[PDB]
């Protein structure tokens, strides 16, 4: 089914999912994002531990990025809620294969 802001993260297919590894693995784009992420109190979802936690998953040969989202789409967060953090931190590529016409232009 074809995405939409209010889509929930964890409804995403393999497919996406794979695809968004490709786009936010690199170049420490996973870390960017994982950074970003708050909770409802403002405070950071991830501490410095989990961080080097999904940054030992290479080398196993595993995707970051697969596992941050797998865990952060636990609470229910929303395609539109990565958009606007991909979009935030600069990483425009995701964002626009996921929601083109929500990336500044």
């Known amino acids: 089914k074809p995405l939409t802001p209010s889509t929930?993260?964890?409804n995403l297919n393999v497919g996406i999912l794979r695809k968004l590894s490709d786009f936010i693995d690199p170049q420490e784009g996973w870390?960017?994002?994982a950074v970003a992420i708050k909770k409802?109190?403002?405070d950071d979802r991830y501490n410095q531990f989990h961080i080097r936690r999904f940054e030992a998953l290479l080398q196993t040969g595993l995707s970051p990025t697969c596992?941050?989202?797998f865990d952060?789409?636990?609470t229910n967060c929303?395609?539109?809620d990565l958009v606007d953090?991909?979009?935030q931190i600069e990483l425009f590529a995701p964002a626009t294969l996921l929601l083109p016409d929500?990336?500044?232009q």
Do not use: D, F, H
Request: positive net charge.
């Open 31 to 33: 870390k960017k994002l």
């Open 67 to 69: 596992e941050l989202l």
């Open 72 to 74: 952060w789409g636990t």
């Open 102 to 104: 929500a990336v500044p």
């Open 78 to 80: 929303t395609v539109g």
């Open 8 to 10: 929930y993260i964890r």
């Open 40 to 42: 409802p109190s403002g």
């Open 85 to 87: 953090l991909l979009v």
